[PDB]
């Protein structure tokens, strides 16, 4: 599956929002 640091769109996910990579 696609990681959270794959694109900004993913960073806008309540699941990837708490990700130090997206934060």
JSON list of C-alpha atoms in Angstrom, two decimals:
[
{"chain": "A", "resi": 1, "resn": "UNK", "atom": "CA", "xyz": [0.00, 0.00, 0.00]},
{"chain": "A", "resi": 2, "resn": "UNK", "atom": "CA", "xyz": [0.95, 3.68, -0.41]},
{"chain": "A", "resi": 3, "resn": "UNK", "atom": "CA", "xyz": [2.78, 5.17, 2.57]},
{"chain": "A", "resi": 4, "resn": "UNK", "atom": "CA", "xyz": [1.85, 8.49, 4.19]},
{"chain": "A", "resi": 5, "resn": "UNK", "atom": "CA", "xyz": [4.97, 10.25, 2.90]},
{"chain": "A", "resi": 6, "resn": "UNK", "atom": "CA", "xyz": [4.03, 9.40, -0.68]},
{"chain": "A", "resi": 7, "resn": "UNK", "atom": "CA", "xyz": [2.04, 12.58, -1.33]},
{"chain": "A", "resi": 8, "resn": "UNK", "atom": "CA", "xyz": [0.48, 15.58, 0.41]},
{"chain": "A", "resi": 9, "resn": "UNK", "atom": "CA", "xyz": [-2.99, 14.16, -0.26]},
{"chain": "A", "resi": 10, "resn": "UNK", "atom": "CA", "xyz": [-2.17, 11.36, 2.17]},
{"chain": "A", "resi": 11, "resn": "UNK", "atom": "CA", "xyz": [-0.99, 13.86, 4.78]},
{"chain": "A", "resi": 12, "resn": "UNK", "atom": "CA", "xyz": [-4.56, 15.18, 4.81]},
{"chain": "A", "resi": 13, "resn": "UNK", "atom": "CA", "xyz": [-5.70, 11.86, 6.27]},
{"chain": "A", "resi": 14, "resn": "UNK", "atom": "CA", "xyz": [-6.77, 11.57, 9.93]},
{"chain": "A", "resi": 15, "resn": "UNK", "atom": "CA", "xyz": [-4.58, 8.46, 9.98]},
{"chain": "A", "resi": 16, "resn": "UNK", "atom": "CA", "xyz": [-1.48, 10.11, 8.52]},
{"chain": "A", "resi": 17, "resn": "UNK", "atom": "CA", "xyz": [-2.16, 13.46, 10.20]},
{"chain": "A", "resi": 18, "resn": "UNK", "atom": "CA", "xyz": [-0.53, 12.28, 13.42]},
{"chain": "A", "resi": 19, "resn": "UNK", "atom": "CA", "xyz": [2.52, 11.18, 11.44]},
{"chain": "A", "resi": 20, "resn": "UNK", "atom": "CA", "xyz": [5.79, 12.94, 12.37]},
{"chain": "A", "resi": 21, "resn": "UNK", "atom": "CA", "xyz": [6.58, 12.84, 8.66]},
{"chain": "A", "resi": 22, "resn": "UNK", "atom": "CA", "xyz": [3.45, 14.80, 7.76]},
{"chain": "A", "resi": 23, "resn": "UNK", "atom": "CA", "xyz": [3.58, 16.98, 10.87]}
]
